[PDB]
Amino acid sequence: TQGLPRVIELFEARRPKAKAVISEIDGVVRIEEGEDRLSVFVESEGFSKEYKLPKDARLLVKDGDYVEAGQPLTRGAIDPHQLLEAKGPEAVERYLVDEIQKVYRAQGVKLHDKHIEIVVRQMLKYVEVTDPGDSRLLEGQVLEKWDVEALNERLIAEGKVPVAWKPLLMGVTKSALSTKSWLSAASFQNTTHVLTEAAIAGKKDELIGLKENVILGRLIPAGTGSDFVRFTQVVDQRTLKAIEEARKE
C-alpha cells in the first residue's frame, strides 16, 4: 500500500496489508524448500524460530545470513504492533515517523519531522497495568497520570507499590477517545456512556486541552489564553508614581 491510504494505515496503527515477517529473536538464517511450502528459520544454539512464508513471499535474505531481533525478513510493511513488543516503544516511534515522511517525501512534500513526532507521541500516551497500587490490574491509564504514582510513592510517602505498567500502541483515533476529559469524550458518538461512567465517579475535568474549553465556550488555554502570558499587566510611568504616593499612608 502507498499514498494516502498508507498515511492512515500508519496513524491508525493497524496490521498493514502485506504483513512482512520480522524475526522475534536474533540468530542465523535457514531457508528451506522453494516448492511445496516455503519457510525461513531463524536459529541459534538454544532458540530456533520457524516462519512459514506464503511462497509469493518476496523475502530478501539469502541462506546462512546473520540477523538481528525485530529486523524485517520478508519485505513490505512492519506490523507496528509486532514491532513495539519486540523492539520497544522508542524504537516503534522512530519507525512510524520515518515511514510516514516516506510517503509525503516520495510524492513530493517537505514538512518537518518534529510535526509527525508530536502526533506519534500521543499514539503512545497510554499504558496498561501489571500489579496495581490503588486500582484494578486491567485499566488503561495516561502515562503521566501514573507517573506521580510511580516515583512519588517513593520520593516522599514511600510504600505500597510504584505501580508496574506496560506500554500500549493506541491508534491515533483510539488514542483520541481515551481522554481524561468527559467534556470532549462526550462530543463523540456514544455520549450517554461517557456521561454515565463519568458521573458515577467524582470525575473532574481540569479542562487541560482545547476542544473541551471550546465546548463550554471558555477562553482557549493557548496563546493569549495561556496562563503563562494571560496574567501580564501594564502600567504607566506617571501611573507608577501614583502608587509611590499611595501605598504608605
Binding site: L195, A199, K204, I215, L216, G217, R218
Partner: protein, 43 residues
C-alpha cells in the same frame, strides 16, 4: 456608545450547559484553583 466592546465574563453557552445537565439530575459543579465550589450563575 464608543466603548471597547464587552469582555463576556461568563459565556452563556457555559450556563446553558450546566443546566441542560441538571434537568437530567447529574450535579455538575464548578471549582476554582485551590478547589472550592465557585458558582457561575447568581442571576
Amino acid at each position: 456608545k464608543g466603548e471597547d466592546v464587552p469582555e463576556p465574563s461568563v459565556p452563556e453557552s457555559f450556563r446553558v450547559l450546566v443546566k441542560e445537565l441538571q434537568a437530567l439530575a447529574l450535579d455538575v459543579q464548578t471549582l476554582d484553583e485551590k478547589d472550592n465550589p465557585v458558582d457561575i450563575f447568581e442571576g
